[PDB]
Write a protein that binds this ligand. Structure first.
Ligand SMILES: Sc1ccc(Cc2ccc(Cl)cc2Cl)nn1
Ligand SMILES: [Mg+2]
Ligand code: NA
Ligand SMILES: [Zn+2]
Length: 342
C-alpha cells in the first residue's frame, strides 16, 4: 500500500538516498518510481520547509500521493517528469544557495509548483495557435491557449480535497500568497509566456539581479521554473537521447491521429517531416541554451549547466552530420547512437 508504505517510510535524510543526490551530475530518473514520493518528502525536509511552515506530515503524504496520481501515462508528460523537475528545483536550492536571493515562501512555492505543473497532461499539445506548421513558428510564438491554467486548477482541486490541504493552517494572507505564487509559476511553464518575458529577463541579467527588487523576484522565479522544466538537457548524452525518444513518441501519437483524421499536424509531430536531431538542435539553440545562459549570467555556479546543454547540442550536431533520422523506428529507440558517439 503506497500510503501505509509512505507513512512507514517516515522522512529519510537525503544521505539515505544517495551521496550524490544534491549533485548536478545526479540523474533523478534513475530512482525507482516507487521511491519517488519518499524522495519528495526527503527534499522538503532537507530544505527545512516541513518544520519552518509546520506542515502536517500525514497531510503532506496524502498530498504527494494525490499529485503523483494526478499524472497520466503519456511517454513524456508523466509523474517521472514532474519528479525530475522537482528534483532540479532542489538542486538549484542546494547548489545556487537560493535562500540568499529569494524568500523562503517563494522557493517553497517553486518546489510545489514543479510537482504540480503538468497535472493531468494527456500527451497532447494544441496550444501553439500558429497558422504555419513550421517548427520555427512554434519556437517563436508568444501567444497560445494556455493549457497551464488546467494544470493549476488540478493543483487547487487536490488542495481542496478533504485531508490534502498542506497549507490550510496558514494565515489567510500567506495562503493567498502561496496560491498566487503557484498560479504565476505554473503559468510560467508556457513557452509562449517565456517568450513574452524574455526581453525582461535579458534586461534583468544586464543590469544585475537585485534581491530587493520585487519584479526581479517574479522574473527569477519564471526563469528558474523553465530551467527546472528543461533540466533533462543538463545531464549526459543518455538522458537527452532517451528524453528525445519520449518527447517524439508522444508528439507522433498526436500527429499520427491528426493525419489519419485528415488534418495537418505541426511539422515536429509529423513523423514524415520530423528530423529529430535537427529539431533537438533547433530547440536547444532557440530555447534551452539561452535559458541556461541567462541562469549562468545571474549565477556563476550555474555555468556547468549551460556547458552540459551546449555539449549535448554538439552531440546532436554530430548525430545530424552522420545520420538522417526522419521520424522514429518501429521500436521508438535511438539507443544505437550511444555507441556511435562512444
Ligand atoms: S529538450 C526539447 C523540449 C521540447 C521539444 C519539442 C518541442 C516543443 C516545443 C517547441 Cl516550440 C518546439 C519543440 Cl522542437 N524538443 N526538445
Ligand atoms: Mg507543461
Ligand atoms: Na512540456
Ligand atoms: Zn513540464
Amino acid at each position: 500500500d503506497e500510503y501505509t508504505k509512505l507513512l512507514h517510510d517516515g522522512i529519510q535524510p537525503v544521505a539515505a538516498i544517495d551521496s550524490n543526490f544534491a549533485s548536478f551530475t545526479y540523474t533523478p530518473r534513475s530512482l525507482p518510481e516507487d521511491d519517488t514520493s519518499m524522495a519528495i518528502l526527503s527534499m522538503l525536509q532537507d530544505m527545512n520547509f516541513i518544520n519552518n511552515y509546520k506542515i502536517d506530515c500525514p497531510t503532506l503524504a496524502r498530498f504527494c500521493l494525490m499529485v503523483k496520481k494526478g499524472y497520466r501515462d503519456p511517454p513524456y508528460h508523466n509523474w517521472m517528469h514532474a519528479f525530475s523537475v522537482s528534483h532540479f528545483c532542489y538542486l538549484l536550492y542546494k547548489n545556487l544557495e537560493l535562500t540568499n536571493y529569494l524568500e523562503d515562501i517563494e522557493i517553497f512555492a517553486l518546489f510545489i509548483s514543479c510537482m504540480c505543473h503538468d497535472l493531468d497532461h494527456r500527451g497532447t499539445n494544441n496550444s501553439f495557435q500558429v497558422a504555419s506548421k513550421s517548427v520555427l513558428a512554434a519556437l517563436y510564438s508568444s501567444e497560445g491557449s494556455v493549457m497551464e491554467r488546467h494544470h493549476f486548477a488540478q493543483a487547487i482541486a487536490i488542495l481542496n480535497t478533504h485531508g490534502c490541504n498542506i497549507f490550510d493552517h496558514f494565515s489567510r494572507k500567506d495562503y493567498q500568497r502561496m496560491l498566487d505564487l503557484m498560479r504565476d509559476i505554473i503559468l510560467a511553464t508556457d513557452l509562449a509566456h517565456h517568450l513574452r518575458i524574455f526581453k525582461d529577463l535579458q534586461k534583468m541579467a544586464e543590469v544585475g539581479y537585485d534581491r530587493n527588487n520585487k519584479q526581479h523576484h517574479r522574473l527569477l522565479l519564471c526563469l528558474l521554473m523553465t530551467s527546472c522544466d528543461l533540466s533533462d538537457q543538463t545531464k549526459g548524452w543518455k538522458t537527452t537521447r532517451k528524453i528525445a525518444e519520449l518527447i517524439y513518441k508522444e508528439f507522433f501519437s498526436q500527429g499520427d491521429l491528426e493525419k489519419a483524421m485528415g488534418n495537418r499536424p505541426m511539422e515536429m509531430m509529423d513523423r514524415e517531416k520530423a528530423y529529430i536531431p535537427e529539431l533537438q538542435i533547433s530547440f536547444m539553440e532557440h530555447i534551452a541554451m539561452p535559458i541556461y545562459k541567462l541562469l549562468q549570467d545571474l549565477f556563476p555556479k550555474a555555468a556547468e549547466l549551460y556547458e552540459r546543454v551546449a555539449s549535448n547540442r554538439e552531440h546532436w550536431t554530430k548525430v545530424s552530420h552522420k545520420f538522417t533520422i526522419r521520424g522514429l523506428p518501429s521500436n521508438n529507440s535511438l539507443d544505437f547512437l550511444d555507441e556511435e558517439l562512444e
